[PDB]
Every structure is written in C-alpha cells, then in structure tokens.
Structure 1
Amino acid sequence: KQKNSLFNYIYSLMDVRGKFLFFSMLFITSLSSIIISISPLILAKITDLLSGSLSNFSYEYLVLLACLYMFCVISNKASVFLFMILQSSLRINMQKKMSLKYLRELYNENITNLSKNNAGYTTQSLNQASNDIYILVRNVSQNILSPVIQLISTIVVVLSTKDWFSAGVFFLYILVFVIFNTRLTGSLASLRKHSMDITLNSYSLLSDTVDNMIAAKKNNALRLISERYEDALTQENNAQKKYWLLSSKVLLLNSLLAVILFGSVFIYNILGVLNGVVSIGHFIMITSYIILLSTPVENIGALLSEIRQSMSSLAGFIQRHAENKATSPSIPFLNMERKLNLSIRELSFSYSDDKKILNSVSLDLFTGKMYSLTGPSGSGKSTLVKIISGYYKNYFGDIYLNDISLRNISDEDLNDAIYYLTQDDYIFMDTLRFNLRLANYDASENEIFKVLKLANLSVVNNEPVSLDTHLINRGNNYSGGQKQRISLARLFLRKPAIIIIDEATSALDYINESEILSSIRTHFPDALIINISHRINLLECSDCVYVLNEGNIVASGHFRDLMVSNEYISGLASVT
C-alpha cells in the first residue's frame, strides 16, 4: 500500500520537463544497452574473418566490422555523458518542488510534533530524503531495462551458438546472484537506516550546540560540549562501520562467485580452443561476454540494494512528517462575529501522561472586558491560553466561542478570531517589514508604519526606524523590549476578537508598558483581553482576576476583593 504511494510521490515532483528528462534517461539507457549487446558478435566476426586465412579476406569487410564496433563503443559513451547531463537537469528540476512541499508539509504539522525535533534535524532530514529520491530516480531510469536487455541478449546469443555449458553457467550466475543478494538486501537497508538516523541525531546535536554557543562559551564548557558531540560522532562511525563490513563482504563474496563461475566458462572454452572443439571467434565471443556482463551484473546488484535501502529510509521520512492527525471536523463557510465570548467548561489537560496540568478549569469571559490570570510558575497559565489558541487539541472538556466549539473551528478562523502574544518572542531573520507583514500580507507601507507608533517602535535612539532594518538570527539585533514591541506591532495589523498577552510586556519599561497596553484597548475596544502577569499593577487594571493553582482555578472576582482572601495574590502584595 505504502509502496504505491512512495513512487506516486516521486512522480508528482516531476513537472512536464521533469517527466521528459526522466523518460529520456530511461530511453537512452535502454537504446545503448541494445547497441552494446551487438558488439561481442562484431568482435567474434572480426576474429573468424582473420583466423585461419593467411591475410586472405575482405579488407573492406574488416573495416566495416571495425567501424561498427567503434560506433558501438562511441554511442555507448555518448549515452553515458547524455544520461549524466539529463540526470543533473532532472535533479535541479525536482529539487525546488520537493523543498517547498516540505516547508508546506511542515506548516500543516501540529505544534506538539514540530517541537519534537530542531532545525538541524529537519534541515538534514530534507537532505537525506532528497538524496533518497535521487537514488530511486536513478535506479529506475538506469538499472531496470538496460541490465535486463544486456542479460537476455547474452543468454539468447550464447544459447544460439548452441554453447550449453557457457549459457548454462552464465544463467546459473544471474540465478545464484539475484537469490544471494535479495537474501541480504534487507539486512543492509536496516543497517543503513539505523546509521542515517544516528546521523540525524548528530546534526541535531551540532545545531543544538551552535544555537547555544554563547552559553557554552561563557561557562567555559568546551570540554562538556565537545565530548557530547564526540560521543555522537562515535555512535555515527560505529553505525557506518557496521554497514561498511556487510557491504564489503557482499561485494567480496559476489566477486569470488564471479571468478569461480565465469573463470570455469573461460577455462572450458580455452580447452575447447586447444582441442579444436571451439573456434577462436567463439572463444573471443565468450571472453567478450564474460567482460561485458560485469556492468549489467553491477547495475542489478545496485538496484536490489539501492531500491530497497532508499525505499526503507524514505518510508521512515514520509511517516514522521504526514502521520500525526487525529480528526479535525471544522465548519465549511464560517464568518465569525465581531464580538466573541469565551466559555471554558471543565477543561482538563496533560502534556504527557501520569501528570495532569489543567484539572477542571471552568471559566466564562465576555467581550470588551479585560481579565487577569495569575498563579505560580507551573500552574498552567500559558498551557491554558495555548489550548484556547489551538496549540493542542487532545483536551478533556469543551471550549466555546458564542455557542460554536473550538473543535468545530478551522485553524485559519481561530487564528483570525484570537491573537496570542507568546511568552517568548519569534522574530524572523529578515526586514522589520517582513516581520510585520507576517501579521497581514496585504498591508501597505503606511499601515505598517502607523503600527510602529502603536508599538512605540517608530523611533529608536532619537532616529526614525526604517522598515528595511535587517534583523539578525532570533532578532538579537534588537533589545529584549524592542523584540517584544515587534510582536506587539503585529497585533495592530491583525483584527482579533480575543487578545491574549502572556507576560508579553515583561521586558518593557513602565512608560512603554502602559502606553502600549493603553493603545491595545483603544485600538481594539470590543476585544476580550486575557492578561497573564505576576505584577499587581497589571492585575489591578483588569475587570476581573482569576487565580490558577496546580491546574485548578482557585479564586475569582475583583483584585481588591482577592488581595486579602487569596493566598497567592496576598503573596504578591507582600511588597509595599
């Protein structure tokens, strides 16, 4: 079932130019194997014409024979050069389509599955898959028809000259070969997959160490960092050496078998020539076939190995990138109301198992009102808003948005209705313009600059901020607060019903914090605002405060009614 899907996926990556280049590669490889299977006869015809006659033969016929042999050799090499030219053209062709499909496949993945591995891993995963496709494209376009043509014609012709021992031992070899190799192909594929996986693990650890280099540098941790990479590389070498040995054994055994079987056919025809039983022409033909047969034998060996091993390694890739999907019913044409109310009913959640993060959160929130959510680090404020923001769908209980459940809301509509301002910032290495166009693609130069004022990012160090400001990796080109302001500026281009601010202002000064938080309520008057904070002034300003403790909502109501009643908020209101 998955075998059919694999080849259909490779075929789909080929546009019209791609399909021609692939069939041209198959044709040229097939045509040249026809032509080169003629050449051992030409050689035999040259040999007899000369053998016996004492320079008494048609010199014009020898020239015609020698020219035909040359045509064979020239056309076969022209074919090799033409195949590799078409091969690289098809690699280039299929490359772009493959890479975009990956990015688009990664975008449609769930946050839980995305978080599982880093960039180093996903980057090298594409690498392996691309190469796996390449191998499969090659093995199909080159090692299917061509070795069959050359092996069929060889037994047909040697059978025609009524040499039974030669054609016999020849057919015996292809039989013993195809059996022996298939009986060891899977054993190689498993050893190769396990290696390639360890290789991913190693690239994963390199990107992890390089992304956190400053930390390792400042803690003078070269030894600790170096040793855990050195361990990964040692796991890589050992996995590679295990493949190497099996690969080397198969090659040595296949070589020894060829020497024993084809060596006998060579000795047999030598004795046949010495006892006048066999002609020299025929002896040269059998000699010519023994030599010619190596490349189709090689191309079969390759196909049996390469097709199975690249199909195994490519199977594993398609699995960890298209699998994780529960159901998701969604609504066909939903046009959400400008005013939305949130109703969380007996919400329960666990990230893993054994430990529950949200016990039975029951809340009811309404349009145009600001609410504060607080609790100790580990209560699950972020978790709760993440679930409201559709990060996770594996939850017990229900969440409504004006009668409509979250389960029946499309991820596109949900993201248009709600805007979550994350605890950590996500700044793209690009222009400031690009980082803001993330929020709204169709936004004009003015709409974007207007938004900079709202996020207090229109002027930095008495200088006007350019929309063409290049932003370094993780936006570390900008201050902690300036990073927060990028993410805040995004909100102003968006048009949501619910606005979640998860400690999204923590890096800002008292002036900026208040001005932006003011601009949010001004710009979005009907927006329901959930605010996560450990600070009394941010809790004070809200229409109602909710205290989360160990998964359950322990206290509700006005801040003043809570600053003495509740154990946590009294703990906050310890200062002053």
Structure 2
Amino acid sequence: KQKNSLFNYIYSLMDVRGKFLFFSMLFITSLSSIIISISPLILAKITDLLSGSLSNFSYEYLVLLACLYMFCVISNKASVFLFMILQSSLRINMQKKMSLKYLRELYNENITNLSKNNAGYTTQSLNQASNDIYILVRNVSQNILSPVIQLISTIVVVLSTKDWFSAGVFFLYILVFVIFNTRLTGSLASLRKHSMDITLNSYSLLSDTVDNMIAAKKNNALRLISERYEDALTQENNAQKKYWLLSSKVLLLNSLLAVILFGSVFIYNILGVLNGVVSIGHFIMITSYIILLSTPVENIGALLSEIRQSMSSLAGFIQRHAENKATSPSIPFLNMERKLNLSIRELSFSYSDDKKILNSVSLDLFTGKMYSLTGPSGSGKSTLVKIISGYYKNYFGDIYLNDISLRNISDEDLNDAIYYLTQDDYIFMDTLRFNLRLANYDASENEIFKVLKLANLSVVNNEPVSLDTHLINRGNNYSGGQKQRISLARLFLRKPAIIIIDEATSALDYINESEILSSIRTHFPDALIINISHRINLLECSDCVYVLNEGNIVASGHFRDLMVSNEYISGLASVT
C-alpha cells in the first residue's frame, strides 16, 4: 500500500516537461539496448565471412558489416550522453517542486513534532530524500526495460543457434543471480538506512554546536565540543564500514560466480572450436555475449539493491514528516466576532507522561479587560497560554471562545482571533519590512512605518530606521529590547480579539515598556489581554490577577487584595 503512494509522490513532482524528460530517458535507454543486442551477431557475421576464405569474400559486405557495428557502438554512446543530459535536466526540473513541497509540509506540521529536530537535521533530511528520489527515477528510467531487452535477445539468439550449454548456463546465471541478490538486498537496505540516520544525527550535532559556538568559545570548551562530534563521526564510520563490507562481499561473490559460470561457457566453446564441433564465428558470438552481458547484469544488480534501499530510506522520511495528526474537526466558514470571551473549564495537560503540568485550570475571562498571570518558574504560565494559542491539542477539559470550542476552531481562524507575543523572539534573517510583513502580507509602506512608531522602532541612535535594514541570523544585529520591539510591531498590523504578552517586554526600559503597553490598549480597546509577568507594576495595572502554582490556579482577584493573602505575590512584594 505504501509502495504505490511512494511512486505516486515521485510522479507528482514531474510537470509536463518533467514527464517528457522521464519518458525520453526510458525510450532512448530501451532503443539503445535493442541496437546493441544486434552487434554480437554483426561481429559473428564478420568473423565467418573472413574465416576459411583465403581473402575470397565480398569486401563490400565486410565494409557494410563493419559500418553497422560502428553505428551500434556510436548510437549506444550517443544514447549514454543523451540520457545523462536528460537526467540532469529532470533533476533541475523536479528539484524546485520537491523543495517547496517540503517547506509547505513543514508549515502544516504540529509545534511538538517541529521542536523534535533542528535545522541541520531537516536540511540534510531533504538532501537524503532528494538523492533517494534521483536514484529511484534513474533505476526506473534505465535499469528496467534495457537489461530485460538485452537479456531476452541474448538467450533467444543463443537458443536459436541451438547452443544449449551456453544459453543454459547463461539463463542459469541470471536465475542464481536474481535469487542470491534478493536474498541479501533487504540486509543491505537496513544497514544503509541505519547509516543514513546516524548521518542525520551527525549533521544535527554539527548545527547544534555551530548555533551555540559563542557559548563553547567563551567557556574554552573546544575539547568537550570536539569529542562529542568525533564520537558522532565514529558512530558514522562504523555504520558505513558495516555497509561497505556486506556491499564488497556481494560484489566479490557475484564476480566469482560470473567467472565460474561464464568461464565454463568460454572453455566449452574453446574445446568446441578445437574439435571442429563449433565455428569461430559462433565462438566469437558466445565470447561477445559473455562480455556484452556484464552491463545488463550490473543494471539488474543495481535495480535490486538501489530500488529496495532507496525505497526503505524514502519510506522512513515520508513517515517522520506526514504521520503525527490526531483529528482536528474545524468549522467550514467561520467569521469570528470582534468581541471574544475566554472560558477555560477543568483544563489539564502533560507534555510527556508521569508528570502533569496543568492540574485542573478553571478560568473565565472577558472582552476589553486586562488580566495578569503569575507564579513560580515551572508553574505553567507559558504552557497554558500556548494551549490557548493552539500550540498543543492533546489536553483534557475544554476551552471556549463565545460558545465555540477551540477543538472546532481552524488554526488559521484561531491565529486571527488570538495573537501570542512569545517569551523568546523569532526574527527572520531578512529585511525589517519582511519581519513585519509576516504579520500582514498586503500591508503598505505607510501601514508598516506607522507601526514602527507604535513599537518605538521608528528611530534608533538619533537616526531614522529604514524598512530595508538587513537583519542577521536570530536578529543579533539588534539589541535584546529592539528584538522585542520587532515582535511588538507585528501585533499592530494584526487585528486580534485576544492579546497574550508572555514576558514579551522584559528586555525594554521603564519608559518604552509603559509607552508600548499603553499604545497596545489604545489601538486595541476591545481586546482581552493576558499578561505574564513576575513584576508588581505589570500586575498592578490589570483588572484581575491569577496566581498559578504547580499547575493549579491558587489565587484570583485584585492585586491589592492578593499582595498579603497570597504566598507568592507577597514574595514578589518583598522589595520596597
């Protein structure tokens, strides 16, 4: 069942030009195997015409024979060059379509599955998959029809000249070969997959070390960093050597079998020529067939290995990239209300198992009101807002948005209704314009510049900020606070009902913090605001404060009513 899905996926990557290039590759490979299967006859015809006669034969017929053999050899080589020209053209063609499908497939994945592996890994995963497709495209377009044509014609013709021992041992070889190899193909595929996986692990550890180089540099940790890579490389070499040995043995055993079987057919026809039983023309034809048969035998060996091993390694890739999906019912045409209220009823959550992060959170929040959420680091403030923000769907209990449950809300609509300002910043290595256009694609040059003022990012160091400012990897081109302001400027282009600010202002100074937080409430008057903070001034300003402790909501109401009642907020209000 998964076998059919695989080839349909490869076929789909080919546009009209892609389908032509693929069929041209199949045709030219097939045509040349027909032509080259003729050539050992031509050689035999040349041999007899000369053998015996003492220069007494048609010199014009020898020239015609020699020219036909040349046409065979030329057309077979033109075919090789034409196939590789078509192959690269098809690689180029299928490449773009393959890569975008991956990016779009990665966008539709869940946050839990995305977080599982880094960029180093996903980047080299595309690499392995692309190459896997390439191999499969080749093995199909080249090693299916062509070796069958050359093997059929060879047994048919040798059978026609009534040589039973030759055609017999020839057919015996293809039989022993196809059996022996298939009885060892899976054993290679498994050893190759296991290797390729360790290779991903190794690219993953390189990108992990390079992304955290500054940390390792400043801790003078070259030895610790170098040794954990050197260990990964050692796991890679050992996995590669294990494949190499099996691969090397199969090749040597297949070579020794060929020498024993085809060697006998060569000795048999030698004795046949020495005892006048067999003609020289025929001897040359059997000798010519033994030599010609190696390439179709090679193309079969390849197919039996390469098709099974690239199908296994490609199966594993499609699995860890299209599998993880619970249900998600969603609503067909939903047009969310400008005013939305939040109702969390007996919400429970665990990231893994054995440990519960949210015990039985029961809350009720309303339009145009600001709420503060606090608690110790590990209580689950981020977790709770992430679930509200649809990061996770494996939760016990229910969450409503004006009667409508989250479970029945499409990820697109939820993201239009709620805007989560994350604890960590996510700045794209691109222009400032690009980072803000992330919030709204259709936004004009003015709408974007207006938003810079609202986030206090219109002027940096007495200089006006350009929308064309190039932003380095992780936006480390900008200060901690300037990073927070990019993410804040995004909110102003968006139009949400709920606004979550998870410690999203921590890097800003008192002036900026207050001015932006002011501008938020001004620009979004009816917006429900959840604010996560460990700071009294941010807790004070709220219409109501919620204290989360070890998963459960332990305290509610006004900050003043809590600053003495509650154990945690009294701990905060220890200073001054």
Secondary structure in structure 1 of the residue aligned to 2:97: helix
In structure 1, the gaps of 5 or more residues are none
Distance in 2 (CA, whole Å) between partners of 1:349 and 1:499 is 22
Q: Structure 1, residues 472-527: CA drift from partner, whole Å, max 9, x if none?
A: 00000000000000000000000000000000000000000000000000000000
Distance in 1 (CA, whole Å) between partners of 2:373 and 2:15 is 53
Query: Normalized against structure 2, the TM-score is what?
Result: 1.00
Q: CA deviation at 1:156?
A: 0.1
Secondary structure in structure 2 of the residue aligned to 1:338: coil
Q: CA deviation at 1:323?
A: 0.2
Q: Structure 1, residues 198-232: CA drift from partner, whole Å, max 9, x if none?
A: 00000000000000000000000000000000000
Partner of 1:23: 23
Secondary structure in structure 2 of the residue aligned to 1:547: strand
Q: Structure 1, residues 235-293: CA drift from partner, whole Å, max 9, x if none?
A: 00000000000000000000000000000000000000000000000000000000000
Partner of 1:377: 377
Distance in 1 (CA, whole Å) between partners of 2:100 and 2:180 is 40
Distance in 1 (CA, whole Å) between partners of 2:461 and 2:274 is 98
Q: CA deviation at 1:95?
A: 0.1
Distance in 2 (CA, whole Å) between partners of 1:189 and 1:518 is 62
Q: Structure 1, residues 103-158: CA drift from partner, whole Å, max 9, x if none?
A: 00000000000000000000000000000000000000000000000000000000
Q: Structure 1, residues 61-93: CA drift from partner, whole Å, max 9, x if none?
A: 000000000000000000000000000000000
Distance in 2 (CA, whole Å) between partners of 1:164 and 1:335 is 80
Q: CA RMSD in A?
A: 0.1
Alignment pair present for 1:87 and 2:117: no
For this pair of structures, how many residues does the alignment match?
A: 576
Distance in 2 (CA, whole Å) between partners of 1:522 and 1:355 is 41
Q: Structure 1, residues 29-64: CA drift from partner, whole Å, max 9, x if none?
A: 000000000000000000000000000000000000
Q: Structure 1, residues 394-435: CA drift from partner, whole Å, max 9, x if none?
A: 000000000000000000000000000000000000000000
Structure 1 residues 103-114: aligned runs within 5 Å: 103-114=103-114
Distance in 1 (CA, whole Å) between partners of 2:379 and 2:290 is 76
Secondary structure in structure 2 of the residue aligned to 1:534: coil
Secondary structure in structure 2 of the residue aligned to 1:570: helix
Q: CA deviation at 1:390?
A: 0.0
Q: Structure 1, residues 538-562: CA drift from partner, whole Å, max 9, x if none?
A: 0000000000000000000000000
Q: CA deviation at 1:443?
A: 0.1
Distance in 2 (CA, whole Å) between partners of 1:332 and 1:7 is 32
Query: Normalized against structure 1, the TM-score is what?
Result: 1.00
Distance in 2 (CA, whole Å) between partners of 1:333 and 1:60 is 82
In structure 2, the gaps of 5 or more residues are none
Alignment pair present for 1:447 and 2:444: no
Distance in 1 (CA, whole Å) between partners of 2:248 and 2:82 is 31
Distance in 1 (CA, whole Å) between partners of 2:170 and 2:91 is 36
Q: CA deviation at 1:311?
A: 0.0
Secondary structure in structure 2 of the residue aligned to 1:351: coil
Q: CA deviation at 1:536?
A: 0.1
Distance in 1 (CA, whole Å) between partners of 2:19 and 2:8 is 13
Distance in 1 (CA, whole Å) between partners of 2:404 and 2:175 is 66
Structure 1 residues 339-488: aligned runs within 5 Å: 339-488=339-488
Distance in 1 (CA, whole Å) between partners of 2:567 and 2:176 is 81
Distance in 1 (CA, whole Å) between partners of 2:50 and 2:481 is 92
Q: CA deviation at 1:21?
A: 0.1
Distance in 1 (CA, whole Å) between partners of 2:329 and 2:278 is 78
Q: Structure 1, residues 283-331: CA drift from partner, whole Å, max 9, x if none?
A: 0000000000000000000000000000000000000000000000000
Distance in 1 (CA, whole Å) between partners of 2:353 and 2:325 is 19
Secondary structure in structure 2 of the residue aligned to 1:478: coil
Secondary structure in structure 2 of the residue aligned to 1:174: helix
Distance in 1 (CA, whole Å) between partners of 2:41 and 2:397 is 80
Q: CA deviation at 1:391?
A: 0.0
